[PDB]
Amino acid sequence: NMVPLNPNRIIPDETSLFLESILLHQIIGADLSTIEILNRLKLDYITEFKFKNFVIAKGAPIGKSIVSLLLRCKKTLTLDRFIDTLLEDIAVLIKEISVHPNESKLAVPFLVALMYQIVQFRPSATHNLALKDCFLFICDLIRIYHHVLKVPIHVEPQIFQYELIDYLIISYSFDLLEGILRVLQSHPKQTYMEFFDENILKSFEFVYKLALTISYKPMVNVIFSAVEVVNIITSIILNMDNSSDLKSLISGSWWRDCITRLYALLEKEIKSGDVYNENVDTTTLHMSKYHDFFGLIRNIGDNELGGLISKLIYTDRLQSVPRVISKEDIGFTAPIIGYKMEKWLLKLKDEVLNIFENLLMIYGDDATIVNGEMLIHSSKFLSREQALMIERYVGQDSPNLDLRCHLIEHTLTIIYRLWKDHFKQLREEQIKQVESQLIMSLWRFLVCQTETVTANEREMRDHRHLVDSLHDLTIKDQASYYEDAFEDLPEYIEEELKMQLNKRTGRIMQVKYDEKFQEMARTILESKSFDLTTLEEADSLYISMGL
Amino acid sequence: ESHVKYLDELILAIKDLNSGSLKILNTLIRNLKDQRRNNIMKNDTIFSKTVSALALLLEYNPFLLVMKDSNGNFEIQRLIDDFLNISVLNYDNYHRIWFMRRKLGSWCKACVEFYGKPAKFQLTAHFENTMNLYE
C-alpha cells in the first residue's frame, strides 16, 4: 500500500545540472561545447579586464576566463546568484568588447548564447532582478555599438566582416531579448511588477524601433526576435493579476508606437517563392544569402549558418578574429525550407494577431488602444488572407494552408469580440471605411451553412487527396510515428481521425468551417449590435446561399 | 442500451431544433451528469459518440457558456472542470484524451473568444491555480 522510500536519494544539484547544461552549451551547428567555443576567443588589444574577478589579457581567451568563472562560481554562488553573476560579468564583457570598436566581437554572440542557456535554465529559479539587468546591459552594449546598431540597407558584396561578427551578435542579442522576456513571462503571475520598469519598457521601445526597421532592410531573424519580445510583454500583461499597474506603466504611446509597426509587419507579405531573396524590400521577408540562421530559440529552418557557427571558432587554431562564416557558401535542395519559412513567418503573423486579439480580450471595455483602427487593420488582415487562401492557397498543397487558416479564424475571433461588445470606440468612419471586410467575413462563414458539401465519406477524403496531400502525409506521419494507440483501434479513434481531417481540409477550402465559426460570423450581421446592412442590403447577401 | 439512442436522438434533435423551447440546457445537464460510470466503460465507442455529440452541441451553443452558471462565474468553467474530472475517470486513453482536449478547445476556448476579459480571466485563474495546486 504505502508509498515507499529510498536509502540513497541521489539528487544531482540544481547547479550541478546547471553546469551540465552550461559547460556543454551548444547551439545548432555550433558543433561544440559552447564553453569551448568561448575558449577559442582571444583578445590582444584588451590586456586588462576585471569586474567580479575576470582576468583577461592579449592571447588570453574569453573562454579561458569563462571556464574560470563557471567553475569557481559554482561553489561560490547559488543557482540564481550564479545566473546573475554570469549575466553581469559576461555582460561587462558584452560591453567592454562592444565599446571596443577596434576589436572584433566574436565574444558577444556565444556569450549571449551562454546568456540564453542561463536564462532558459529555469523560469522559477531565474530571478527577475537578474533578468531586468540582463536586458539593460544588452541595451548598453547596443549603445556602445552605435555604429552598427541597426542594419542600414554596395560595400556589402559577399563579405562577412562585421556581418559574421557584429550582425551575427545582433541576431543572437535579439533572440536573447526574446527568451529573456519569455522567462519573464514564465515567472509566476504574481511578481512581475519589479520587472515592469519604464527603464525596461523604454529601452525595449527603442530596440523595437531599431528592429522593425521600416526605413532600412530589417533582418528577419531580428524581426522575429522583436515581435516575439512584444508577444512576451503582452502575455506578462494578460498574466499580472494587478494588470492595472503594468498597463499604467506601458504608456498608450508605447502601445501605439509598437502596434503601428506591428501593422506595418502584419502587412508585409509572406511569399515562399522569394522568402530567401533580397528583392522587393518592405514586403518580401528577405533573410536570404545576406543573413539566415537560428539565433537562440529560432529553428529558422535549415539553420544554414548553423554549422558555420562552429565554423566561426577555428576549433583547430587560437583565433583573435572570427574564422570566416561564409555568407553565401550557404545552402538548397528543395523549398521545404521556404515552405517551413512560410509557416514560420505565418506563426510570426499569428503572434502579431494573437497579442492583437489578446489586447482585444483584456481591454474589452473602452480603451485608447481598442480604437477601431485596430478594427480597420485587423479586419483588413481577415478578409485579405481569406481572399489569398480561397484564391491562391488552394491547390498549393502546403502545410502553410493550415496556418493561414489559423490566421483568418483567429482574426475572426478578434473582430467578432470587437463587434459583440466593444463598439464604444466605433464610429461610422470605421464602419463604412471597413464594412466590406466585416460583412464578407460574415458571409464567408454564412454560406458554409449548407452542410450538403460533404454529407458523406466518398468526397472530402478525395478532396484532401487533391490539395491537403501535405497535411494528409502528416496525418499519416502521425498514425505512424507521433502517437501511441494507432494500432488495434477501438473503432472511434480512426473515425475521429477521418472526420477531423475531412473537416480540416474543408477548413482549408473556406467551406464547411467549424459551425461555431459559422455562427461567430453570422451573429455580427444578424444580431443587431451593429446592423451593418439595411433591409435593402441584407437580403442582397442572403440570396448568395438561398435565403 | 438506453444511451446509444440518447446520443443518436441528441444529434437528431440538434438537427431538428436548430433554427429557422431551448430544452437543450436540460440535455447538457444530463450529458454532464451521464458519463461518470464504469458500467460500459470498455465501450469507448458510445461514450465517444455521446461526448463528441456534446462537442458539436456546445459548438452550436457557445451562448450556453455565457449564461453565468450561479457560482461567481459563467457556465464555461463549471463545464470544463467536470470535463476534467470525467477525463481523470478515463485518464489513460491517448486518443480519447486527444480528441477530449480538442473538444475543450472547441467549447471553453469558444466561450473565451466570444466574450472578453471576463471569460478569459475565469479560465486563466482556474487553470493557472490548478497548475499551482498540483505542484
Short mmCIF file of all heavy atoms in Angstrom, two decimals, chain B residues 4 11 18 21 23 25 33 40 43 46 56-57 59 63-64 66 75 78 82 92 95 98 111 115 119 131, unseen atoms left out:
data_model
loop_
_atom_site.label_atom_id
_atom_site.label_comp_id
_atom_site.label_asym_id
_atom_site.label_seq_id
_atom_site.Cartn_x
_atom_site.Cartn_y
_atom_site.Cartn_z
N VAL B 4 -27.19 4.82 -26.21
CA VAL B 4 -26.88 4.86 -27.64
C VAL B 4 -27.93 5.69 -28.36
O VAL B 4 -27.61 6.61 -29.13
CB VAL B 4 -26.78 3.43 -28.21
N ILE B 11 -28.10 14.13 -31.48
CA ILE B 11 -27.74 14.77 -32.74
C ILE B 11 -28.98 15.00 -33.60
O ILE B 11 -29.07 16.00 -34.32
CB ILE B 11 -26.66 13.98 -33.49
N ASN B 18 -32.85 23.32 -34.60
CA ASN B 18 -31.64 24.05 -35.00
C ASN B 18 -31.89 25.56 -35.04
O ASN B 18 -31.36 26.31 -34.22
CB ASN B 18 -31.15 23.53 -36.35
N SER B 21 -38.77 27.18 -25.90
CA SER B 21 -38.08 25.98 -26.37
C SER B 21 -36.80 25.78 -25.57
O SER B 21 -36.83 25.74 -24.34
CB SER B 21 -37.75 26.09 -27.86
N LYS B 23 -34.80 23.54 -24.67
CA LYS B 23 -34.60 22.47 -23.70
C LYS B 23 -33.27 21.76 -23.88
O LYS B 23 -33.06 20.67 -23.35
CB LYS B 23 -35.76 21.48 -23.75
N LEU B 25 -30.62 22.85 -22.63
CA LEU B 25 -29.89 23.01 -21.38
C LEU B 25 -30.10 21.82 -20.45
O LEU B 25 -29.17 21.39 -19.76
CB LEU B 25 -30.29 24.33 -20.72
N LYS B 33 -23.99 14.96 -16.40
CA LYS B 33 -24.23 14.06 -15.28
C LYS B 33 -24.48 12.62 -15.72
O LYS B 33 -24.98 11.82 -14.92
CB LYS B 33 -25.40 14.58 -14.44
N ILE B 40 -20.35 0.62 -18.76
CA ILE B 40 -19.97 0.20 -20.11
C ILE B 40 -18.69 0.90 -20.53
O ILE B 40 -18.47 1.18 -21.71
CB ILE B 40 -21.12 0.45 -21.11
N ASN B 43 -16.67 0.10 -23.52
CA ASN B 43 -17.26 0.50 -24.80
C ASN B 43 -16.97 1.99 -25.00
O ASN B 43 -17.84 2.85 -24.83
CB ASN B 43 -18.75 0.20 -24.84
N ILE B 46 -19.51 4.28 -27.61
CA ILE B 46 -20.73 5.01 -27.29
C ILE B 46 -20.42 6.26 -26.47
O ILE B 46 -21.01 7.33 -26.69
CB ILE B 46 -21.73 4.10 -26.56
N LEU B 56 -20.05 18.91 -30.56
CA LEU B 56 -20.79 19.62 -31.60
C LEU B 56 -21.95 20.41 -31.01
O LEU B 56 -22.31 21.48 -31.52
CB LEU B 56 -21.25 18.62 -32.66
N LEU B 57 -22.53 19.92 -29.91
CA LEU B 57 -23.61 20.63 -29.23
C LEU B 57 -23.14 22.00 -28.76
O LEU B 57 -23.64 23.03 -29.22
CB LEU B 57 -24.10 19.80 -28.04
N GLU B 59 -20.54 23.44 -29.52
CA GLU B 59 -20.13 24.16 -30.71
C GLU B 59 -21.29 24.96 -31.28
O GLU B 59 -21.12 26.10 -31.72
CB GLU B 59 -19.58 23.17 -31.73
N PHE B 63 -23.22 30.30 -26.63
CA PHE B 63 -24.04 31.18 -25.80
C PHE B 63 -24.43 30.50 -24.49
O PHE B 63 -24.60 31.19 -23.48
CB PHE B 63 -25.29 31.61 -26.58
N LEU B 64 -24.57 29.17 -24.50
CA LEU B 64 -24.83 28.46 -23.25
C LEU B 64 -23.74 28.72 -22.22
O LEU B 64 -24.01 28.69 -21.01
CB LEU B 64 -24.96 26.95 -23.50
N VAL B 66 -22.29 31.54 -21.79
CA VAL B 66 -22.36 32.94 -21.28
C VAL B 66 -23.68 33.10 -20.52
O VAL B 66 -24.22 34.23 -20.50
CB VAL B 66 -22.21 33.99 -22.40
N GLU B 75 -20.95 29.63 -17.38
CA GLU B 75 -21.07 28.18 -17.49
C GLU B 75 -19.76 27.52 -17.90
O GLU B 75 -19.63 26.30 -17.75
CB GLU B 75 -22.17 27.84 -18.50
N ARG B 78 -17.50 25.74 -14.84
CA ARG B 78 -18.25 24.62 -14.29
C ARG B 78 -18.50 23.55 -15.34
O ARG B 78 -18.82 22.41 -14.99
CB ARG B 78 -19.58 25.08 -13.69
N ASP B 82 -15.79 19.72 -14.65
CA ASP B 82 -16.47 18.43 -14.75
C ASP B 82 -15.93 17.62 -15.92
O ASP B 82 -15.75 16.40 -15.81
CB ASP B 82 -17.97 18.64 -14.89
N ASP B 92 -6.17 7.28 -19.11
CA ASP B 92 -5.05 6.74 -19.88
C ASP B 92 -5.21 6.98 -21.38
O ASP B 92 -4.29 7.45 -22.04
CB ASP B 92 -4.87 5.25 -19.58
N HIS B 95 -5.85 8.74 -27.49
CA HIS B 95 -6.65 9.48 -28.45
C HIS B 95 -7.97 9.93 -27.85
O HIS B 95 -8.56 10.92 -28.31
CB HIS B 95 -6.89 8.65 -29.70
N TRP B 98 -6.95 12.97 -26.38
CA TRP B 98 -6.57 13.81 -27.50
C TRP B 98 -7.79 14.56 -28.04
O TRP B 98 -7.86 15.79 -27.94
CB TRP B 98 -5.92 12.93 -28.57
N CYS B 111 -15.94 29.93 -25.80
CA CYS B 111 -16.57 30.85 -24.86
C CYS B 111 -15.70 32.07 -24.61
O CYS B 111 -16.19 33.20 -24.60
CB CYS B 111 -16.84 30.14 -23.53
N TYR B 115 -16.59 36.05 -25.68
CA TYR B 115 -16.61 37.14 -24.71
C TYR B 115 -15.31 37.92 -24.72
O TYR B 115 -14.66 38.06 -25.75
CB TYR B 115 -16.91 36.61 -23.31
N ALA B 119 -14.53 36.06 -19.37
CA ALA B 119 -14.38 34.63 -19.63
C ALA B 119 -12.92 34.21 -19.63
O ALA B 119 -12.57 33.18 -19.05
CB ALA B 119 -15.04 34.26 -20.95
N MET B 131 -2.70 24.33 -11.86
CA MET B 131 -1.29 24.02 -12.08
C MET B 131 -0.51 24.19 -10.79
O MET B 131 0.20 23.27 -10.35
CB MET B 131 -0.75 24.93 -13.19
#
